[model samples]
Target: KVFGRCELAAAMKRHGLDNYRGYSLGNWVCAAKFESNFNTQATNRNTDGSTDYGILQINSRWWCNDGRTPGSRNLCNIPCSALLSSDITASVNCAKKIVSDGNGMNAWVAWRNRCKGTDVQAWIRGCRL
Candidate 1:
């Protein structure tokens, strides 16, 4: 496990993702909390049978290759399982690419369903960085 929200925030900061692509750190934090609760190994199947991977819940249909999923673009040049490790470097990089592609946090349904238009300030309330 990745400890708590502060640790994740610090990791995101180290990766320079705090405000990348105009999304705030709180946006990322809130998305992580709602998507997978900071669980790197988390995976879920969508109603369409596509799978969401890692803390960011990246989709196999577009982001990573899961071998079983057809039509995977693998734009991040990474295996989906790589996003399920405690080390978040690859996951964060892939997220940056997703956000840069113009989707922003809207890439994750969790963000739109829960984090969007919410205060979200509490996500980074006590994180020193």
Candidate 2:
């Protein structure tokens, strides 16, 4: 199935965005599409063998698993999961916090680069199944 409007709504809600008039998750999900094709089970490996995992391409070994890493928290036991924890909205909230914090805007900007507009309808029109 293609990316649905509900997924956009879910992304917005999970990211604490109640004001679509001011900001939008269209950019965010567009980034999500580019980063992981909206697949919740995405992952990758850096040249160093460290693993990045899940839709947001969260560095699993870095943020929540490897003890030597900076943000480690023991999540590798879950296997291939990213910031999206077991809680549906945790990753979304985390992503929002990151974006608000400014570092996460890359994904949004990346989305804007490929999609037609930041508007919701334009974003939906640009994605694939």
Candidate 3:
């Protein structure tokens, strides 16, 4: 499912991404923008043969079981397909698990390159929540 910018920002707030892992709600919005452009259907295949899934672009090598990448541990024990849903609760939970494993938002290169330490207020500027 595709999401409007503020629409996604609001959903993220409801799902507990606001200030999650020392990152602001705006930061989450920015990462989602860069990572998947708010499209839950988004998928990116890494050069290393790991595929990224859904709005958060979660990696198949560890978090979800795509069954193709070697060394896939399924740490999140979730199917990669589940991350493509617009509901995003499963995606959110998996993201928290990644951070809990000490990856923080650094797990996504897009976040480091586009969202981290940047001015992210514009990502959620007009959103009421």
The TM-scores of all predictions, comma-separated, are: 0.94, 0.57, 0.95
Candidate numbers, best TM-score first, in rank order: 3, 1, 2
Model 3 TM-score is 0.95
Best candidate (score: lDDT): 3
Worst 10 residues of 3 by lDDT: 99-108
Off by over 4 Å in 2: 1-5, 18-23, 66-87, 107-121, 125-129
lDDT of 2: 0.52
lDDT tens per residue, model 2, 1-129: 233555654755655654433355565566667766766655566666566555556554434463334444543344334354434354564455445544445534445566535564555454342
Instruction: Report per-prediction Cα RMSD to one decimal.
Output: 1.1, 5.6, 1.0
Any runs in candidate 1 off by more than 4 Å, and if so which? none
**lDDT of model 1 at position 112:** 94
